[model samples]
Target: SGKMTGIVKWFNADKGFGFITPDDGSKDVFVHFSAIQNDGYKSLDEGQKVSFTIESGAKGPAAGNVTSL
Candidate 1:
């Protein structure tokens, strides 16, 4: 798809991963620090607004090119 918007549900500073709750409430999407736009230098904040592209991973949905909004 083109892009999706959601709120950061949770993030692990040490693990460098997180999940995003989509605005549509379908399912929680996976996101890695590598996908973050800040060069993985910043951690995602809970309830932070974000925009990203979704892709179906081997297990489920994942977010890429994520950026805060």
Candidate 2:
């Protein structure tokens, strides 16, 4: 798949689970620890810009290949 930009809606540093509000303003996409890169802290700030690919998740769309912009 391709890529898209979005804002970090929120992330759980403890559980390594969070949601991302895509730039398109659609539904929030789910993101997990394994999807992120370049951030060993395993944390992303809310409202921070990022890039990722969208995949059909169990619930809705999940954020993959996540990276801070």
Candidate 3:
């Protein structure tokens, strides 16, 4: 897991998926509902600040264990 900080760019509650654009100028990362912490916000809202880790997923880079910043 690699540390990452970003702003929530988009999220779909129905789809349970989202993307985060890193402040570091890297590519936007993917986030799935299953990767969110149990005690964290139930749904991600656009423009929310977050810190997380990037892990290799089957599809590509995915954000894990995201927490509001």
Candidate 4:
């Protein structure tokens, strides 16, 4: 897919992972800090708006190249 916008449902900064509820109305997508496009700490705030790409992971859908909006 090209890109999608979503809100962060929950993120564990310590564990460096979370889930995103896309505006497209799909299931929650798994997001990792490694996927975050940031220079410093890669983390997300709950209910924060973000844009990212959807990637098909081994388990299911995952968020990649995530950026805060």
Q: What TM-score would candidate 4 get against the native? A: 0.93
Error of 4 at 51 (Å): 0.4
Q: How many residue pairs clash in each candidate?
A: 0, 0, 0, 0
**Tens digit of per-residue lDDT, candidate 3, span 7-35:** 99999999999899989999889999888
* TM-score for each predicted model, relative to the true structure: 0.88, 0.87, 0.89, 0.93
RMSD each, Å: 1.7, 1.6, 1.7, 1.3
Please estimate how well model 1 matches the true structure, expressed as its whole-model Cα lDDT: 0.89
Candidate 1 lDDT over residue span 10-34, tens digit each: 9998999889998888799999888
Clashing pairs in 1: none
* Cα misplacement distance, residue 27 of candidate 3 (Å): 0.9
Candidate 3 matches the true fold with a TM-score of 0.89
> Which of the predicted structures, 1 or 3, would earn the higher TM-score when compared with the native?
3
lDDT agreement of model 3 with the native: 0.88
TM-score computed on alpha carbons, candidate 1: 0.88
Which number leads on TM-score? 4
Model 4 regions lying over 4 Å from their true place: none
In model 3, what are the clashing residue pairs, if there are any? none
The digit string of per-residue lDDT tens for model 4 on 12-33 reads 9989999999999999999988
